[PDB]
């Protein structure tokens, strides 16, 4: 009987600040077993430097809950495993289901799913999409959701899609999943660099681009005008304010960019302000509003949808309670007819989130041409299964797992502080 023998945590930090000034980092989690040498679950929480140590401590504090557990028991009931962590009332106090403690639980949960897909020798998106509607529904926590999504409503959705799974899988495997780029929209970029990168993005096949705004309206008006012209009237152009504005200012601001045909304004205000996003959306119609990369859990997503605060949402592989929670968010969006545009970038976020969007297309919505996954070309060289883009689209992962395992030489080089690079640097 194979069991989990250890939950090792690694404080990995990349000096990306030498290339605000975020130093991309990751609280690297590994679920070790005594089975086939190749059996281990990998996961990670994306941090930006300061605090990766506290995030690591949080993950390491979960060891007691996992060491000694039978692997088959875990893999057989991922729902019960996630709930063993989420239901610890004492750990709930540090949240509940938000912040550092929840993200730590999410990474351990993610590693468990990674482990499950590995054992079944399937890429996560396939592992997920090939579970029965009953197996899928049993992994989600319906507490606090019965007013918007019942177990039965979840089952009907998964059952209707059941018949088309084979066709969707073939479609994805040959066509790939759409991607959008944010590479051209950095605020520090000159107008010429903006148009130049915008043009290159289109040439590479991307059909949607996103620019940052929020610092200076005059600047935003000028950059949006230039981007539109450089891109043409057929490419989608979204904007990201990164939580900068209050409600009134956001409305005044966005009304001045509407003319450039905005795909959507992302995070106009605080990620906790459900009613504010609704207010902004109403004040700038028909400019679509989105949020989600920092949304704490499925309950807040529920309210965003209930209040009609969003036109579309982002989901993040590492911000919530792992796969289990994202499935509930995905079912929620599907039920309310709201598109999902996964957030990525950071450290391995693309590698992780691609699977959730792909499982979603096959087993939940069957729609992908109306949306896209974010893509950023960073740190991919540190992963065994790096994402692959082909003319603006993600190629479906083939290797088994969640695509989270990083090259051991990478961990040996950037582990902090014992890492080779950090030992010499300081």
Annotated binding site: 24, 210, 240, 242, 266, 293, 343-345, 374
Interface with its own copies (CB under 8 A), residue from 54, 156, 203, 409 = 54
- Let me know: does 125 contact 397? Beta carbons within 8 Å: yes
Q: How many whole angstroms separate alpha carbon 28 and alpha carbon 84?
A: 21
Residue 401: DSSP 8-state: B
Residue 275 binds its own copies (CB under 8 A): yes
Q: How many whole angstroms separate alpha carbon 420 and alpha carbon 378?
A: 21
Tokens of 140: 């989600």
Residue with smaller CB distance to its own copies, 58 or 257: 58
Residue with smaller CB distance to its own copies, 68 or 248: 248
Residue with smaller CB distance to its own copies, 176 or 271: 271
Tokens of 89: 């009332």
Q: Are strands 177-185 and 393-394 parallel, antiparallel or unpaired?
A: antiparallel
Q: In angstroms, what is the minimal distance from the CB of 13 to its own copies?
A: 10
How many residues at the interface with its own copies, by CB under 8 A? 60
Write the binding mask 257 to 296 for Mg ion: x where contact by CB under 5 A, - elsewhere.
---------x--------------------------x---
Q: How many whole angstroms separate alpha carbon 16 and alpha carbon 137?
A: 40
Strand order in the sheet with 40-47: 4-13, 25-33, 40-47
Residue 101 binds its own copies (CB under 8 A): yes
**Nearest CA among 222, 243, 236 for reference residue 182:** 236
For residues 276, 150, 142, 334, the Cα torsion angle rounded to the nearest 10 degrees is -50
Residue 417 binds its own copies (CB under 8 A): no
- Let me know: does 164 contact 366? Beta carbons within 8 Å: yes
Residue 186 binds its own copies (CB under 8 A): no
Q: Which of 212, 277, 302, 382 is catalytic?
A: 212
Interface with its own copies (CB under 8 A), residue from 12, 91, 202, 330 = 91
- Per partner kind, with CB cut-offs from 5 to 8 A, the member of its own copies, Mg ion, none near residue 338 is none
Interface with its own copies (CB under 8 A), residue from 39, 67, 94, 173 = 94
Active site residue 212: yes
- Per partner kind, with CB cut-offs from 5 to 8 A, the member of Mg ion, its own copies, none near residue 187 is none
**Nearest CA among 124, 112, 123 for reference residue 33:** 112
- Let me know: does 123 contact 396? Beta carbons within 8 Å: yes
With b for 16 or more beta-carbon neighbours within 10 A and e for fewer, the 337-347 pattern comes to: ebbbbbbbbbb
Q: Which stretch binds its own copies (CB under 8 A): 127-135, 154-162, 302-310, 320-328?
A: 302-310
Angle between helices 274-283 and 298-306 (to 10 degrees): 30
Residue 57 binds its own copies (CB under 8 A): yes
Residue 169 binds its own copies (CB under 8 A): no
Binding-site residue ranges for substrate: 24, 210, 242, 266, 293, 343-345, 374
Residue with smaller CB distance to its own copies, 169 or 296: 296
Residue 140 binds its own copies (CB under 8 A): no
Residue with smaller CB distance to its own copies, 85 or 237: 85
Residue 240 binds Mg ion (CB under 5 A): yes
Residue 240 binds its own copies (CB under 8 A): no
Helix ranges (H only) for 48-98 are 52-60, 63-66, 71-76, 78-86, 89-93
Residues annotated as part of the active site: 212, 343
- Contacts to Mg ion by CB under 5 A: 240, 266, 293
């Amino acid at each position: 009987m194979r069991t989990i023998i250890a939950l090792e945590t690694h404080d990995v930090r990349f000096p990306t600040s030498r290339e605000p000034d975020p130093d991309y980092s990751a609280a690297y989690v590994v679920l070790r077993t005594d089975g086939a040498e190749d059996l281990a679950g990998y996961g990670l929480v994306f941090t930006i430097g300061r605090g990766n140590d506290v995030q690591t401590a949080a993950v390491a504090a979960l060891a007691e809950h996992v060491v000694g557990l039978s692997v088959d028991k875990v893999i057989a009931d991922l729902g019960a495993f996630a709930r063993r962590l989420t239901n610890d009332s004492q750990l709930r106090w540090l949240g509940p289901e938000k912040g550092v403690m929840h993200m730590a639980i999410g990474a351990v949960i993610n590693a468990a799913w990674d482990l499950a897909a590995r054992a079944a020798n399937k890429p996560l998106w396939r592992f997920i999409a090939e579970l029965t509607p009953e197996q899928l529904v049993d992994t989600i926590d319906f507490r606090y959701l019965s007013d918007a999504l019942t177990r039965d409503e979840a089952l009907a959705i998964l059952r209707d899609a059941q018949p088309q799974r084979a066709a969707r899988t073939a479609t994805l495997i040959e066509q790939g999943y759409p991607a959008y780029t944010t590479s051209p929209g950095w605020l520090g970029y000159s107008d010429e660099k903006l148009v130049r990168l915008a043009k290159e993005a289109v040439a590479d096949g991307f059909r949607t681009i996103k620019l940052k705004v929020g610092a200076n309206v005059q600047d935003d008006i000028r950059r949006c005008r230039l981007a539109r012209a450089a891109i043409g009237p057929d490419i989608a152009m979204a904007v990201d304010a990164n939580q900068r504005w209050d409600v009134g200012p956001a409305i005044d601001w966005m009304r001045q960019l509407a003319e450039f045909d905005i795909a959507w304004i992302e995070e106009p205000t605080s990620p906790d302000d459900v009613l504010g996003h609704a207010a902004i959306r109403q004040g700038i119609t028909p400019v679509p509003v989105s949020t989600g990369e920092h949304t704490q859990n499925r309950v807040v997503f529920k309210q965003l949808l209930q209040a009609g605060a969003v036109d579309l949402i982002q989901i993040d592989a590492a911000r919530v309670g792992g796969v289990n929670e994202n499935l509930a968010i995905l079912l929620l969006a599907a039920k309310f007819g709201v598109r999902v545009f996964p957030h990525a970038g950071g450290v391995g976020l693309c590698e992780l989130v691609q699977h959730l969007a792909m499982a979603d297309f096959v087993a939940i919505t069957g729609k992908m041409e109306d949306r896209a996954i974010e893509f950023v070309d960073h740190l991919h060289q540190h992963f065994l299964d790096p994402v692959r883009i082909q003319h603006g689209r993600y190629l479906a992962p083939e290797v088994p797992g969640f695509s989270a395992e990083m090259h051991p030489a990478s961990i040996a080089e950037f582990s902090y502080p014992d890492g080779r690079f950090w030992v010499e640097d300081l």
